[PDB]
Design goal:
about 220 residues, mainly beta, Thrombin, subunit H, binds calcium ion, serine protease
């Protein structure tokens, strides 16, 4: 997360670290057996780590649960990054308490102007590299569709929204990918892509979760 602050241990109870030997992406717990992440984070052999804060030190609140199956959106396109959303079913139900909890899915889409919390263990530098060991947090407003389409001409589909700062210096980044964008206690987005990180006039782009609620509920009821 570039230009963010340390969240503090287990203050973001729905945040998950996806690990295949090393933390590679984040994700969000939506019920005790299912995680939502980004389809660009797909790989085989994912272990979901819940209850994390320092991802390099076992501190007492972790649950590491292997996934049973991963489902990429039927219409995911990796070249345009449209429909960048994937479901991960866990092998056992997780145990939910205040430090590990699920987040609600949206009933209504969020308007531009709404301030959201974005969090993850991705890169913290705009130039160069530095990956933190403890979870970072960023508050950022959803931008209007016209600032977003004017920053990324020809790239924004109806399933994408921008959030962040046009002046730069504060953004999500590589590694926060698949992580949560929470606004008024509902999951509204998934960290998806951007041009670099924290560049002037290049805000973060996020998968618009309210467009996916019926696919998520139907998939969960049948799998
Ligand atoms: Ca840990």
């Amino acid at each position: 997360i570039v230009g963010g602050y340390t969240c503090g241990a287990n203050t973001v109870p729905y945040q998950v670290s996806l690990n295949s030997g090393y933390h590679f992406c984040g994700g969000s717990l939506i019920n005790s057996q299912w995680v939502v992440s980004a389809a660009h984070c797909y790989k085989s052999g994912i272990q979901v780590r819940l209850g994390e804060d320092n991802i390099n030190v076992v501190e007492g609140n972790e649950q590491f649960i292997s996934a049973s199956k991963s489902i990429v959106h039927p219409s995911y396109n990796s070249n345009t990054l449209n429909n960048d959303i994937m479901l991960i079913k866990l092998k056992s139900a997780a145990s939910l308490n205040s430090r590990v909890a699920s987040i609600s899915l949206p009933t209504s889409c969020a308007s531009a102007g709404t301030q959201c919390l974005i969090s993850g263990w991705g890169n913290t530098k705009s130039s160069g590299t530095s990956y933190p060991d403890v979870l970072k947090c960023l508050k950022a407003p959803i931008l209007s569709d016209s600032s977003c389409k004017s920053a990324y001409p020809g790239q924004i589909t109806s399933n994408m929204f921008c959030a962040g700062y046009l002046e730069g210096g504060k953004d999500s980044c590589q590694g926060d990918s698949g992580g949560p964008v929470v606004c008024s206690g509902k999951l509204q987005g998934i960290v998806s892509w951007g041009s670099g990180c924290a560049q002037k006039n290049k805000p973060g782009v996020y998968t618009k979760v309210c467009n996916y609620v019926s696919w998520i509920k139907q998939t969960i009821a049948s799998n």
